Design an enzyme around this catalytic site. Sequence first.
Site, PDB file in Angstrom:
ATOM      1  N   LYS A 163       0.822  -1.205   0.000  1.00 30.36           N
ATOM      2  CA  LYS A 163       0.000   0.000   0.000  1.00 30.36           C
ATOM      3  C   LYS A 163       0.860   1.261   0.000  1.00 30.36           C
ATOM      4  O   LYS A 163       1.368   1.695   1.035  1.00 30.36           O
ATOM      5  CB  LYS A 163      -0.970   0.030   1.183  1.00 30.36           C
ATOM      6  CG  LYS A 163      -1.995   1.143   1.027  1.00 30.36           C
ATOM      7  CD  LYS A 163      -3.077   1.132   2.075  1.00 30.36           C
ATOM      8  CE  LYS A 163      -2.669   1.911   3.297  1.00 30.36           C
ATOM      9  NZ  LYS A 163      -3.865   2.151   4.146  1.00 30.36           N
ATOM     10  N   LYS A 165       1.624   5.129  -0.092  1.00 38.17           N
ATOM     11  CA  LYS A 165       0.974   6.354   0.334  1.00 38.17           C
ATOM     12  C   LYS A 165       1.392   7.450  -0.632  1.00 38.17           C
ATOM     13  O   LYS A 165       2.573   7.806  -0.696  1.00 38.17           O
ATOM     14  CB  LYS A 165       1.422   6.722   1.746  1.00 38.17           C
ATOM     15  CG  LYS A 165       0.917   5.782   2.802  1.00 38.17           C
ATOM     16  CD  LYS A 165      -0.451   6.205   3.275  1.00 38.17           C
ATOM     17  CE  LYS A 165      -0.955   5.287   4.372  1.00 38.17           C
ATOM     18  NZ  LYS A 165      -2.097   5.913   5.092  1.00 38.17           N
ATOM     19  N   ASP A 194      -3.161   5.021  -1.633  1.00 41.01           N
ATOM     20  CA  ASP A 194      -4.038   5.716  -0.696  1.00 41.01           C
ATOM     21  C   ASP A 194      -3.651   7.190  -0.725  1.00 41.01           C
ATOM     22  O   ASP A 194      -2.760   7.631  -0.003  1.00 41.01           O
ATOM     23  CB  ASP A 194      -3.877   5.133   0.710  1.00 41.01           C
ATOM     24  CG  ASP A 194      -4.578   5.956   1.773  1.00 41.01           C
ATOM     25  OD1 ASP A 194      -5.720   6.416   1.553  1.00 41.01           O
ATOM     26  OD2 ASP A 194      -3.974   6.151   2.843  1.00 41.01           O
ATOM     27  N   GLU A 220      -7.491   3.880  -2.714  1.00 39.53           N
ATOM     28  CA  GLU A 220      -8.166   4.313  -1.496  1.00 39.53           C
ATOM     29  C   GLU A 220      -8.284   5.833  -1.293  1.00 39.53           C
ATOM     30  O   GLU A 220      -7.294   6.570  -1.344  1.00 39.53           O
ATOM     31  CB  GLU A 220      -7.487   3.661  -0.288  1.00 39.53           C
ATOM     32  CG  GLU A 220      -8.055   4.079   1.047  1.00 39.53           C
ATOM     33  CD  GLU A 220      -7.410   3.360   2.207  1.00 39.53           C
ATOM     34  OE1 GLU A 220      -7.768   2.195   2.440  1.00 39.53           O
ATOM     35  OE2 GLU A 220      -6.562   3.956   2.902  1.00 39.53           O
ATOM     36  N   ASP A 245     -12.345   5.350   2.833  1.00 37.51           N
ATOM     37  CA  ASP A 245     -11.727   5.242   4.149  1.00 37.51           C
ATOM     38  C   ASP A 245     -12.160   6.407   5.027  1.00 37.51           C
ATOM     39  O   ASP A 245     -12.876   6.207   5.998  1.00 37.51           O
ATOM     40  CB  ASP A 245     -10.201   5.198   4.050  1.00 37.51           C
ATOM     41  CG  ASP A 245      -9.524   4.878   5.387  1.00 37.51           C
ATOM     42  OD1 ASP A 245     -10.221   4.650   6.401  1.00 37.51           O
ATOM     43  OD2 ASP A 245      -8.272   4.849   5.413  1.00 37.51           O
ATOM     44  N   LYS A 269     -12.869  -0.011  10.043  1.00 32.34           N
ATOM     45  CA  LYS A 269     -11.957   0.509  11.061  1.00 32.34           C
ATOM     46  C   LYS A 269     -12.716   0.682  12.374  1.00 32.34           C
ATOM     47  O   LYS A 269     -13.516   1.616  12.499  1.00 32.34           O
ATOM     48  CB  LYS A 269     -11.396   1.861  10.630  1.00 32.34           C
ATOM     49  CG  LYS A 269     -10.470   1.803   9.452  1.00 32.34           C
ATOM     50  CD  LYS A 269      -9.724   3.098   9.312  1.00 32.34           C
ATOM     51  CE  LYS A 269      -8.420   2.877   8.599  1.00 32.34           C
ATOM     52  NZ  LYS A 269      -7.605   4.117   8.657  1.00 32.34           N
ATOM     53  N   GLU A 323      -4.810  -4.882   6.581  1.00 34.43           N
ATOM     54  CA  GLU A 323      -3.571  -4.126   6.670  1.00 34.43           C
ATOM     55  C   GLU A 323      -3.254  -3.900   8.139  1.00 34.43           C
ATOM     56  O   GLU A 323      -2.856  -2.806   8.535  1.00 34.43           O
ATOM     57  CB  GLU A 323      -3.715  -2.785   5.947  1.00 34.43           C
ATOM     58  CG  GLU A 323      -4.961  -2.024   6.370  1.00 34.43           C
ATOM     59  CD  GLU A 323      -5.142  -0.696   5.666  1.00 34.43           C
ATOM     60  OE1 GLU A 323      -4.856  -0.609   4.451  1.00 34.43           O
ATOM     61  OE2 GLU A 323      -5.588   0.259   6.339  1.00 34.43           O
TER      62      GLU A 323
HETATM   63 CL   LIG Z   1      -4.973   4.881   6.678  1.00 37.16          CL
HETATM   64 MN   LIG Z   2      -6.607   5.465   4.292  1.00 36.36          MN
END
Ligand SMILES: [Cl-]
Ligand SMILES: [Mn+2]
Lengths: 370, 370, 370, 370
Positions: A163, A165, A194, A220, A245, A269, A323
Site C-alpha cells: 500500500k 501512500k 491511498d 483508497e 476510508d 476501522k 492491513e
Molecule cells: Cl490509513
Molecule cells: Mn486510508
Amino acid sequence: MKIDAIEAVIVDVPTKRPIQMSITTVHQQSYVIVRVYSEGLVGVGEGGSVGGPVWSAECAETIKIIVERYLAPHLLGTDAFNVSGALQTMARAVTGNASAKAAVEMALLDLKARALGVSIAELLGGPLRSAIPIAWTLASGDTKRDLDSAVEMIERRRHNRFKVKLGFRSPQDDLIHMEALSNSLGSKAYLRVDVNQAWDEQVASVYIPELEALGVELIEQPVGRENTQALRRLSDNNRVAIMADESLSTLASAFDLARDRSVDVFSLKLCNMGGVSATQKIAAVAEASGIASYGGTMLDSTIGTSVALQLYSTVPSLPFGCELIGPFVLADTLSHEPLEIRDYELQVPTGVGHGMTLDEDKVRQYARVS
Amino acid sequence: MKIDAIEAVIVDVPTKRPIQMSITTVHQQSYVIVRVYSEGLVGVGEGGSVGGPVWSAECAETIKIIVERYLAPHLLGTDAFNVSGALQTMARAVTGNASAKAAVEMALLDLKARALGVSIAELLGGPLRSAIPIAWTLASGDTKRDLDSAVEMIERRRHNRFKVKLGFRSPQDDLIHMEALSNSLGSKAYLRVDVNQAWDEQVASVYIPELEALGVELIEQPVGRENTQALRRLSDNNRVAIMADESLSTLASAFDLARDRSVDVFSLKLCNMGGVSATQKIAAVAEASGIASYGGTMLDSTIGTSVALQLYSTVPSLPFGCELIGPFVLADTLSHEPLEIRDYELQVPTGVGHGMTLDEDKVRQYARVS
Amino acid sequence: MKIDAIEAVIVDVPTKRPIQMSITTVHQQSYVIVRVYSEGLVGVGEGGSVGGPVWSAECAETIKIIVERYLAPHLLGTDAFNVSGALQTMARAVTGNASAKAAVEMALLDLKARALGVSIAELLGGPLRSAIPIAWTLASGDTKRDLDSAVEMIERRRHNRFKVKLGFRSPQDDLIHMEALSNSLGSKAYLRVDVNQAWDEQVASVYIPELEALGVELIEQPVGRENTQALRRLSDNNRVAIMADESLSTLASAFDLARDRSVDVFSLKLCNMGGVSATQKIAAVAEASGIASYGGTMLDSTIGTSVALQLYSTVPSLPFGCELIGPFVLADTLSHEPLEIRDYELQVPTGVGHGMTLDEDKVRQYARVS
Amino acid sequence: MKIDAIEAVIVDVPTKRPIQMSITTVHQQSYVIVRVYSEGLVGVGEGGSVGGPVWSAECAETIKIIVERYLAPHLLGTDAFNVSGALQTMARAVTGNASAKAAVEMALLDLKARALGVSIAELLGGPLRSAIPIAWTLASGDTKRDLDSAVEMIERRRHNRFKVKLGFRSPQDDLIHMEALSNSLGSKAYLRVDVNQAWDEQVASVYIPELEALGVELIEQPVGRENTQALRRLSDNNRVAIMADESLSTLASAFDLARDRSVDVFSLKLCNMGGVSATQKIAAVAEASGIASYGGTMLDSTIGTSVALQLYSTVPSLPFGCELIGPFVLADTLSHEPLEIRDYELQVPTGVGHGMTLDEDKVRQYARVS
Ligand SMILES: [Cl-]
Ligand SMILES: [Mn+2]
Ligand SMILES: [Cl-]
Ligand SMILES: [Cl-]
Ligand SMILES: [Cl-]
Ligand SMILES: [Mn+2]
Ligand SMILES: [Mn+2]
Ligand SMILES: [Mn+2]
C-alpha cells in the site's frame, strides 16, 4: 457481572521508522488503553487517533477526558455482560468520539469473552478463516528505500501486497514513483494506493486511469472525505476498485455510500466506526449492497489489532485482505504476546478474548499525554 | 463440540380457532422440530410454513427432506460452536429454503448458548428490554366475533394492539368491518391491517387513505410481494406507515426496499429470512436506512417464539412491538414451559438458550406429515 | 376431456461425462416425469432441477410431493382442455415451485395437442422456423479436453457455437483458458461464457472487457442472481451482450430487468419460468422492451427439449439460437424417438404434441429418488 | 390447409341512434368483412375505424385496398394454419394499418379454429369466465335523454356500468352533466368518463379531481394521445384510475406507458392493436407491470365483438369488465346468431371459432364504400 471501575491511561509508543502520509508524518503513535475492572477479572481495550486530531477529529487527550469524564460515570455499577446497553448508554452520553466509544466497547467485549472462556471470535459466532493476507504500506519519502523494504518483505515471506501512500508529492511525481515500484515489483507483488484525500477530483480523473494502467488494483480515498459525489463519478468511469476510508464514519454514511455504489470497497476501522458492534452493521450494509469489505487500522497496537482480527475472521469475505501492521511498524508492544505473520498472512490468535495481556511494565515506560 | 447427529421430525398442532387470511384459513399448524444432538447436550429449534406452500414456497414435507437429505450431511461431525461456518456451509449446500436453513441455525445457536450457560439474548449481547408489546390478530370471518374477542383481550390486560386480516372480503366490505372495529375499539385499542397481497395497487390507493382516516396506524403488505414499486408509490402518497412482509426475503431484497424507502417498516421473520443471523443483518440495513423494525411470526410454537423473543430484545427499537402470538393461538404446546403475557406485553424468558425444553410426550402425540 | 388421474415418477439418468459448473458438477441428472391420463389418451411432461436444490430452490424430491400432494388434487376431475384454468388453479394451490408447475402444464398441453392431432407448435400458432442453431457447452475441467471435443463437433457438422462454463477457476485462470479456446476456435466457432454467478461485480468489470477483446459474443449471468443493479452497470459499460439466466424467474422479474435494460438477452427456461404459457409472456415483455430472446435448458431429457423446441420455433427471433443439448449430454433417453441435429442446427420434430412417447421400459430402469 | 383466396367487401350499417363523441358523432358505422376461403371452409373476420380516418388514421376505403392490394397477394397459397407466419408476413408487407392487419388475422384464426372443431377461446387455451360485465355508453347530447336510457338499462337488467362521453361541451358544462348523472344513478350504477383527448392537461388537472369527488371510477384518455407525460402526472396526482385508449397502439407504446406507470388501465382493442395475437402481448406487458386490462371496442359488429369476447375470456382478470356494445348500438346484424346479455353481463358464445355465420343476405343490403 457489575462494573466496579473503568480506568484509562495514555501511552506514547514511537514508530521504528516514520510513516509519511499526505496529511501527516507518523514519527510516534499515541494511545489510550482502557482497563475495565469487574468482579476480579479485567478487560483490556484501546482507542486512539492518527496524527493527533488530523486523521479524525479525535486525539489522545480528547479520548481520555471523553472516556473518564463522560462515558465512565454512566457505566460504573452497570451489568458488564450487556454490550447492547453499554453502547446504547454511551450514545445517550456523548455525540461522536467513536474512538473513545470503541475503546470502552472492546474492554467489555473482552472481559465478557474471557469470563465465558471463549474468544471474541467464538463469541461473535466462530471464525471462517485462521489467517488473513496482510498488506504492507510503503510510506517513506524515498523511492529506493521503499523498493528495498518491499523486496525484503516478499523474501521473508510475510508481505505479498503493498500500500503506497501517495499525496505528499505532485500528482506528476507520484505517478513516476509508481512507474518504478510497479516496474520492479511487477508480478511478485500486489499494488494499492491511498491518496489520503489529496487529489481534487479533476486531478483524480486524469491520474486514476494512469495508475490503473500500471496494474494498481485498489485506489483508497482519492478525493476529500465529504466529496462522496466525486467518489461516485470516479467509480463509474474507472474499472479500478475505489475504496472509501475517510468518508466512512457512521452507519448512516455507510448506507449513503452504498445506495448508488459510490464506492467499491468499504474499509472497516473499529476506532473510526465506533467499535466491533458498529463495524458489523456496516459490514452488513456492505454485504447487502454488494460492496466488498476491507479491514483497516489506525496503526494501533496489539490490543487493537487482535480485537479487529477476531472480528475480521468472522466476515464472509475480505477480497483484499487487511492491513493490520500496527504492531509491526511500532517500536515496541504493550503485551507479553506477539502476533505472528506466516506466509504473507496474519494469523488469528489462540486465546480467550483477544488473547493479549497488557504488559504493566511496558505501560509504565511510555505513559505520556503528548 | 463436534456435531454427533442432527435429527428432525414433523409435528401437526391444530389452532384453537381458525385464522382466515386472504391467502388461506389456518385450521391447523404444521411444524418441523430439529433436535441437534452433540456431546450429550441437545439443541432444539424449529422451522415451518403457513398454509403449506402458500405463504412461502416451503411447507412441512419440503422442510424435512431439505434438512435431512441436504443440510444435515454436510453438518455432521462439524464444530457445533461455529454458526459462521454452519450458515456458510448451508448456503453452499442448498438454495433458498430459508425455513429449513433457519430451523438448523436455531438448534446450533441454542446448543452453544446452553453450553455456555447464557441465553440466546446474552449471547447476542444482552437485552435492552424485558418485555415487548404483543399484538393480537383478529382473523375470524365474523365482525361481532372479532369485536368480542378484542374487548376481552383488553380486559384481561394482555392485548392493546390489534391486527385485522383484510382481503377475504370485497374492498368495500373490509372498509365497513373497519368502520365497526374502529368505532368500538376507538381509543382503547391500536389498529393495524394486513391485506395479505390481495389489493391491486389502484384498489390500494383509493382504500388506504380511507383506512388512514379511520385511525389505522399500519398497513402491512397492501399489494403483491413482487410489486415493490407500487409499495413505494403508496408510501409516498400516504402518511400511514406501510410495512413489508411478503416482499422481504433475502438481505438483498431488504436493501432493495431500503434504497428509495419503498416501505416504512420491515417485518422481521426468522423463518422467512433464514434465521437469527440473517435477521440481524436486515435489522442493520433497516437501521441504516432509517426504516423501523417490526417483529413478525409464522404462527410458530413456543420453540420459535422464544428464540425470536431473545433476538428482538436486542434490537435498538421496535416502535410497533411484535406479534408473537404463536403459542397463544395454538391448541397445545411442545414444551414444559409457557410464555406469559403481563400487561399487554410479552415477557422475555429467564433461562439458558431460549429456555424451553421439548415435551417428548407432546412431540409423540401429533407427529404427522399432513 | 375430464382429467381422470395425474401420476408422476422420479427417474435418475447419468451424464455420459460430467458437467463442471461454478455451482456444481453434473455427474447425474434427476427428473420427474408427469403422466396425466385422461379419457384414454395420456399426456407426458417433465420437471426437474440442476444439482438438486442448487441451480434453483427445487429438486427431484420436492417436485414430486408438490405435484402429487398439492397440485394434483385440485386438478383431478377438471376439464383437461383448459390450460388457462389449470395454471390459475395451480397458482392458488402453491407458491413458487415453477418446475413442478411447469411439469404439469406440459402434460395438459401435450394431451390437448394430441387430441386435436396437431403439434404443440401448431397449437401455439404454427412455426416460423424448422430448425434452431444449437450451442454446445464445454464444461469439463480440462482445457485440452474441451478443445478436442470442440474441434470434433465442428467436424461432425453439429455445433458451431460454444458455451464455456467459467467460475470454478480463478478469474485470472479462466481468462487464460479463454486465450486458448479463442485462439484455436478463432473464426471456425462462436464463443459464449456463463460465469454461473461466481464474479463479484468488480471482478466482472475488469474481466468482462478482456473476454470482450477475445471475441466472446455473450456473457451469461456474470454476477449474482439478485444483484440486478450490477447486471445493469456492466451492461452500460460493455458492448458485449450480457444475458440474464438465474436472475430471471417470474414475469415480474422479467419486466423489472426490462425497464432500464439491465440485460441484453433473456434466457428462456420453461422449468425456471413456470411452463410454456409463462415463457411466452416473458418473451412478450422482452420483445416490447427490445431485449433479445435466447432459449436455455436445465439439461432436461427429450420430453423437455421437445416441448421447448415446439415453443421456440414460434418465437419471432432467436439471435443467439438455443442450447437444447439435454438429450445429447445424457447417457440414455426415456423415449423411442430421438432428436437429431443436422448442420449445426437442432431440427424441430414432426409429430403431434412434442412427438415423443415415453419408453416405459426406460422409465423402469432408473426410477430412483436420489 | 393452403389459402385459396382472401376476399373482402365494405358494408355500411347505421346506428340506431347517434353517438356524439368529442371527435365525431356516429350516425353510421362502416366496416370491412374479410372472407378468407380455404379448402372449402371459410373464415370470417372484420376490420374498420370510427368516424372514418378520425379515431385512427384508417378508414373503410383505406382498409380495403391495403388488404386486397397489399396483404392478400403475399398470403395467397400460404399455409392457412400458420398465424405466426401470416402475421410476420403481414409486417414485412405493410407498415401500420393495424385494422387491416387485424381483419385478416381474425379470419385465419377463425378458419383454423373451425377446422379443429374448437372455439377461438379453446384455441387460445380455454376460458376462465363465461360472461363479462358489459358497460353501456351514454353519448347522446341530451342529459335527460341519457338518464332515461340509463335507468331503463338497469331495469332491463343488462347494464350496471356507464361510460359517459365528455368533451363536446365546455369543461364547466360536462361537470354539471356529471352532477346530474351521478346524482340519480348514484349507487345503482357505476360511472366512467372518456374525454376523447379534448382536455389540455391543465384543464384535466383541475377537472379530474372534481369528477373523482363525484364517484367516477375511471377516466379514459383525459389528454391527447401523444402527451403520455401528462397522462403520467395526472396519474400520480389523482387516486382515480386513468385508462389509456388512443395512446395505445403498438406493443412498444404499451411498454412505454408501463415503464413508469403512466396509466392505470390499458384498453384492449383488436383493431387498434393489430389483432388477437398482438393484443395478448400487450395484455402480457400490462400483467407484468401491474397495469389493469380493460376490453374496448370500435363499435364493431357481431363478427368483431365475438372474437374479442373469445380472447377476453382468457385474460386473467378484467377489473373493469368490457364495453362490447357493438351489436347493441347497431341498427342491424350481419349474422344469423345474436350475442345476448344476461344480468349485466355479456355472455361468451357457444360455437366453434367465434360462433357466427355471416348473413350473405345482410351483407348484400348495405355494401357501400361511404
Ligand atoms: Cl490509513
Ligand atoms: Mn486510508
Ligand atoms: Cl402474517
Ligand atoms: Cl445453465
Ligand atoms: Cl372509444
Ligand atoms: Mn403479513
Ligand atoms: Mn446459465
Ligand atoms: Mn376511448
